[PDB]
């Protein structure tokens, strides 16, 4: 979203211009997720996929800032949780293919405690953390029973 001078001299009308990229519905095959996605993509993205030698590398290599898609970051969390768990659900009844795919991307091993939080927005992480530490409160009956059996076991040792 910018402006131009009308015939590339500053002494003409300053009038505003939008430069839109060229979009292409293409289709990809993530080997780690093992799925064909239909993704709208640009020519520069196809070029970066070629330079990374695959969409799994393109997603696991590119930084969150640089990639700049929520969907690409969700693919990244999907692949990283698939690598962080060494999931048998990649290719069931084909363990050699699983171990080959998992050893191809051994470079990006992240622990599972970190791979869940990858690419969450701040509100979505607020939600996930809200569901972690939500609990039904403990009925004070049980707390008072614990304290009183503690006290009667202090009196038992007297």
């Amino acid at each position: 979203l910018g402006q131009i001078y009308a015939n590339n001299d500053k002494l003409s009308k300053r009038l505003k211009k939008v430069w839109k990229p060229q979009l292409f519905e293409r289709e990809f095959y993530s080997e780690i997720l093992d799925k064909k996605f239909t993704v709208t993509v640009t020519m520069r993205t196809l070029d970066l996929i070629d330079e990374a030698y695959g969409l799994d590398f393109y997603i696991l290599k590119t930084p969150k800032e640089d990639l700049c898609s929520k969907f690409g970051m969700d693919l990244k969390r999907g692949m990283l949780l698939r690598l962080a768990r060494q999931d048998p659900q990649l290719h069931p009844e084909d363990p050699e293919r699983r171990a080959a795919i998992y050893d191809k991307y051994k470079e990006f091993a992240i622990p599972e405690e970190e791979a869940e939080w990858v690419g969450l927005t701040l509100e979505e992480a607020i939600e996930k953390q809200r569901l972690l530490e939500e609990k039904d409160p403990v009925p004070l009956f049980k707390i008072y029973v614990a304290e009183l059996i503690q006290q009667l076991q202090q009196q038992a040792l007297s």
Binding site: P139, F141, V145, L148, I149, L152
Partner: protein, 117 residues
């Protein structure tokens, strides 16, 4: 033309005045032909005791002493209500002593309330 006045039921056209009521609670529901069915169970029954031979008048005599306010905490109610049964059955399954984990089977559930007042 007033904004300051409270919007009450006395105030609109006919269609407005019919809908809005005061704070009273619905007892049944409307049916076809605008025929109100009253449901017996939605009407509150005033459970009222028998006051015969009852020794408490509305006032207390001024000759009664002064005491100290001790609000009933759950520690106290646990102590007197539960603590003898645990002391007896410990010197010799928590549901034995008047505890209930759930209360979905219960008529007077404590959270959320179903009783009134």
């Amino acid at each position: 033309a007033d904004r300051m006045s409270k919007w009450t039921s006395k105030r609109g056209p006919r269609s407005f005045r019919g809908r809005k009521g005061r704070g009273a609670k619905g007892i049944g529901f409307l049916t076809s032909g605008w025929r109100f069915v009253q449901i017996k169970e939605m009407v509150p029954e005033f459970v009222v005791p028998d006051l015969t031979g009852f020794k408490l008048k509305p006032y207390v005599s001024y000759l009664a002493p002064e005491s100290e306010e001790t609000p009933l905490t759950a520690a106290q109610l646990f102590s007197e209500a539960v603590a003898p049964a645990i002391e007896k059955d410990f010197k010799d399954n928590l549901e034995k002593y008047g505890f209930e984990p759930t209360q979905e089977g219960k008529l007077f559930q404590l959270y959320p309330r179903n009783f009134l007042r």
